[model samples]
Target: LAKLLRYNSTKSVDELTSLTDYVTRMPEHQKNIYYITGESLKAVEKSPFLDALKAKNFEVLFLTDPIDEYAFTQLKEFEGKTLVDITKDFELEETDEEKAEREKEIKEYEPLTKALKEILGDQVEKVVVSYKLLDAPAAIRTGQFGWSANMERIMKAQALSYMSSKKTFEISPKSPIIKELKKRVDEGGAQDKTVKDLTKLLYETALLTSGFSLDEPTSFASRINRLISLGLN
Candidate 1:
């Protein structure tokens, strides 16, 4: 069985080989084998985490079957390399200038970040300015050691499993919604209702984006309805 399975292939129909083959095929710069598990290949492919990885030209294994999750957990590593879940935090190479720019952006948006944390209190662990997001307005990421939202959902469906982990709400500082909100904050309108509504929407939208079930769907819908009305007016 071991000799016939290759987890890294993009399509199920692709030729199957050993894990050794997959590891050897990895690019020189890739430090770990990245994989993302979800309900379906299409959903996993659309994941924000996958998008970020793709932007960096990293290929990821998509594990859609339910059993694939448990299997990967047990098969933690192949050879000397570790298998990494794309949904969790991992270090990526960055230049000194890039680090400084990220710090500056975080500092510049500290006020709004703090405001978002306060506004979304209890619902999120923290609100952070994210450097990984390229197109997303916001996203939810677990701590490096925490269970992913997908894992959490899988556990919750069982009768005996019970675990809770607060998710980090990451805002893309470059996102148009964020830029507009930051401008309002800089101009002394951070306390305005519109800003609060937009912040709440971003938080909810991030939850949906990250494949988590919303706790307050009705409220979210109401807010969206209001926003749509304003847009139409």
Candidate 2:
């Protein structure tokens, strides 16, 4: 048992079981381990959600393997510690000041958000507000307790066949661009013409950020050209 414990901690599978018989001490919290899945450790390190976890000073077990997703689901628990996917329902909260700022922005973008939700319809479950993002204006999140963006990407990339799973679009209500979009929708401005187009673009962008690829690269490229032209004008 001691040898096994040492191997689990140090990842050195030497010395058989004889070394463990020397002592039998275990910390009360010894079973606790934090693990995260990402395309790369650097990517996980930069994740907005990881900031809060780091604030607590926990060492995350970084899993970069595409198979880790399926394997983790089967293993469920390791060394008596429950494996938690940090993506689903992690619900990183905002500071009071941050919350106030987000609410203010949400109010400004209400119309655009409403229109976006209506247009996306079943493509998304609901277009509610979010405060978890910092640098990202928006991201696609699955419904609470659903397959995460990383998991979805890996499964899709496999050459073997797989079933299509529904995806949810979560918008960052604190973004100025989102607020501006809302104003445009509310005022019946010309921006409304671009909403559907932008929605498709934004969704694809989020997928790429989350390590997923689009099925229609040509369409995505055309939309990018259109957006670039609009920006130039």
Candidate 3:
């Protein structure tokens, strides 16, 4: 046993369960044991990262304890199933059956994606269109080999942290918000604060939702206020 502890949705005990009970109940087709780590159950509950998986009724373990994330780093796999941090780039990512679909959408959003890179430079490694998102407008993610953003925060706070080098800014083409953003960027210039505010808000919001704390909440609020002011006018 890895002494693997988990937060369970229940009334008995410490509201915790062992790894054994989890795998026994896992759906047959489920390959990876999915889990999510965050400061609290409340935070992980609202995560946009769960949109797609939740739609499919996947049971994601809420790993709220900071030590569990580090344990997984040492323990890795259990019962032959890979412990997947759903926030990371995993094998479960969506794909296209045809080259045309990916090609057309990527090309269609090429201008918008490229523009976001220039705007979000140094903050995000790349801006991408993911077929994986079911409803979220955007999410920030790292490669599979890296720690979940939640884990990074824990270590960073404890002063034992090493930062992850890559963060992919993933947008959903299905989101009308992203579409509207494309329209704004397509017509407006980079210097326009209107498009710029939206861009920064989108990226920062993704950071917050992805379990990373924002460096500047005041700027985030100012942009939101700007949006509200424009709405009134």
Q: How far is candidate 1 from the true structure (C-alpha RMSD, Å)?
A: 2.8
Q: Of 2 and 3, which scores higher on lDDT?
A: 3
Candidate 2 regions with alpha-carbon error over 4 angstroms: 1-35, 51-60, 70-86, 90-110, 157-162, 189-191, 231-233
Question: What's model 2's overall lDDT?
Answer: 0.57
Give the per-residue lDDT digits (tens) of candidate 3, residues 74-179.
8767864546444454444334464456778778787888888888888877898876565788888876667577777756768743456588899999999898
lDDT values, one for every candidate: 0.72, 0.57, 0.72
Q: What are the TM-scores, per candidate, against the unseen true structure?
A: 0.86, 0.65, 0.82
For 1-233, candidate 2 gives per-residue lDDT tens digits of 22332211112123322223212232343344445566765665555544434454444455565665556567655465434334444332435676677667677665666777776666666666565454666666555466655776666657545555456556676567666666677778534568778877887887666555687799999999998998684
- Each model's number of backbone clashes? 0, 1, 0
Which tens-of-lDDT digit does each residue in 1-233 have in candidate 1?
Answer: 43547454452225554555556666777777677766665666677766666666666676666676667677777654455443555547556788877777789898888777888888878888877776888888776667666777778777443557768888888789888888888888767998898789888888877877787589999999999999684
Off by over 4 Å in 1: 1-19, 79-86, 159-163
**Superior candidate under TM-score, 2 versus 3:** 3
True-vs-predicted CA distance for residue 33, candidate 3, Å = 1.0
